[PDB]
Enzyme design. Structure first.
Site, mmCIF file in Angstrom:
data_model
loop_
_atom_site.group_PDB
_atom_site.id
_atom_site.type_symbol
_atom_site.label_atom_id
_atom_site.label_comp_id
_atom_site.label_asym_id
_atom_site.label_seq_id
_atom_site.Cartn_x
_atom_site.Cartn_y
_atom_site.Cartn_z
ATOM 1 N N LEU A 12 45.368 33.695 35.234
ATOM 2 C CA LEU A 12 45.821 34.829 35.079
ATOM 3 C C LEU A 12 46.477 36.284 36.540
ATOM 4 O O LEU A 12 48.042 36.604 36.666
ATOM 5 C CB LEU A 12 45.968 35.937 34.414
ATOM 6 C CG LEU A 12 45.852 35.040 32.931
ATOM 7 C CD1 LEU A 12 45.474 36.622 31.572
ATOM 8 C CD2 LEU A 12 46.425 34.946 32.604
ATOM 9 N N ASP A 125 44.679 54.766 39.835
ATOM 10 C CA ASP A 125 45.997 53.345 40.008
ATOM 11 C C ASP A 125 46.641 52.976 38.817
ATOM 12 O O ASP A 125 46.817 51.936 38.712
ATOM 13 C CB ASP A 125 45.012 51.942 40.273
ATOM 14 C CG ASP A 125 45.591 50.534 41.178
ATOM 15 O OD1 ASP A 125 47.057 51.665 41.087
ATOM 16 O OD2 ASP A 125 44.888 49.803 41.389
#
Ligand SMILES: C[C@H](Nc1nc(Nc2cn(C)cn2)nc(N2CCOCC2)n1)c1ncc(F)cn1
Length: 275
Positions: A12, A125
């Site tokens: 992924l 983040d």
């Protein structure tokens, strides 16, 4: 969870893979996302163990579900959200995502951040690439790899960084807080309304404003100076002013004048009604 029963399906993107957990050797098992460390240390391992405790501690609709761990060689196992990062889904399917839809996501991200705040967690983040898409009508906050716990007695935590998402105080004093997450949330809202068009990304815009000649160590200094003098990402094409105003309010140089994730959720939902 036992590591002999994870069947590798695909990468992924520390890495993340798609696996099947199938102890019945019969393919019935569910598909799950698995996070591990690319080349790991003890400090890089220490942080990873916190993230895992952090995610286990979180139980919310717009936060990816902790499933478990498995060993030794630590792996984090979570629910698999089938449509991937919001950053990429918007590039893929812009033609069906309208502004009401962007505000739908926007509101869900808020709610997730609100809940995070009640645990005194700081994300650090917050960007569209760390938002996964469960389905067409729902997104979740999908990574907590830089998330920190606020001290009991302080309202900030002092710490390669995503400088173009950071607040000035994070850039200048390395201070992270709910107010810095809100700044970044402003950048997220900008992203959404740019539809991730490539020349309109925060790094591309900021570089354009700084000057594209600038290099390495200087960029951060000049970015700090730009923000100091109220330089800001522009209003994206098609962005209504009232929505840009939320962005610019999040991007306030004064920490305490930035809105709360609760205020934002309401103002967003309210604006969504009116369309
Ligand atoms: C690297 C991974 N990328 C990823 N994750 C998922 N799903 C996922 C990650 N997690 C943690 C849970 N579900 N699905 C995809 N798509 C799926 C289809 O093929 C292209 C990529 N990509 C990812 N992890 C966290 C994050 F916030 C964003 N992206």
């Amino acid at each position: 969870f036992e590591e002999r029963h994870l069947k590798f399906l695909q990468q992924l993107g520390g890495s993340v893979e798609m696996c099947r957990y199938d102890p019945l050797q019969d393919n019935t098992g569910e598909v799950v996302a698995v996070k591990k460390l690319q080349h790991s240390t003890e400090e890089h391992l220490r942080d990873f163990e916190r993230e895992i405790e952090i995610l286990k501690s979180l139980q919310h609709d717009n936060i990816v579900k902790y499933k478990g761990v498995c060993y030794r060689n630590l792996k984090l196992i979570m629910e698999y959200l089938p449509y991937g990062s919001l950053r990429d889904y918007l590039q893929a399917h812009a033609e069906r995502i309208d502004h009401i839809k962007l505000l739908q996501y926007t509101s869900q991200i808020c709610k997730g951040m609100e809940y995070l705040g009640t645990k005194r967690y700081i994300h650090r983040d917050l960007a569209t690439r760390n938002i996964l898409v469960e389905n067409e009508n729902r997104v979740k906050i999908g990574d907590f790899g830089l998330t920190k716990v606020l001290p009991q007695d302080k309202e900030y935590y002092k710490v390669e960084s995503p400088i173009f998402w950071y607040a000035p105080e994070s850039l200048t004093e390395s201070k992270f807080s709910v107010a810095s997450d809100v700044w970044s949330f402003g950048v997220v809202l900008y992203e959404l309304f740019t539809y991730i068009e490539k020349s309109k990304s925060p790094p591309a815009e900021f570089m354009r404003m700084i000057g594209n000649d600038k290099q390495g160590q200087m960029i951060v200094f000049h970015l700090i100076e730009l923000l100091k003098n109220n330089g800001r990402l522009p209003r994206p094409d098609g962005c209504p002013d009232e929505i840009y105003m939320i962005m610019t309010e999040c991007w306030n140089n004064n920490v305490n004048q930035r809105p709360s994730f609760r205020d934002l959720a309401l103002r967003v939902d309210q604006i969504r009604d009116q369309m």
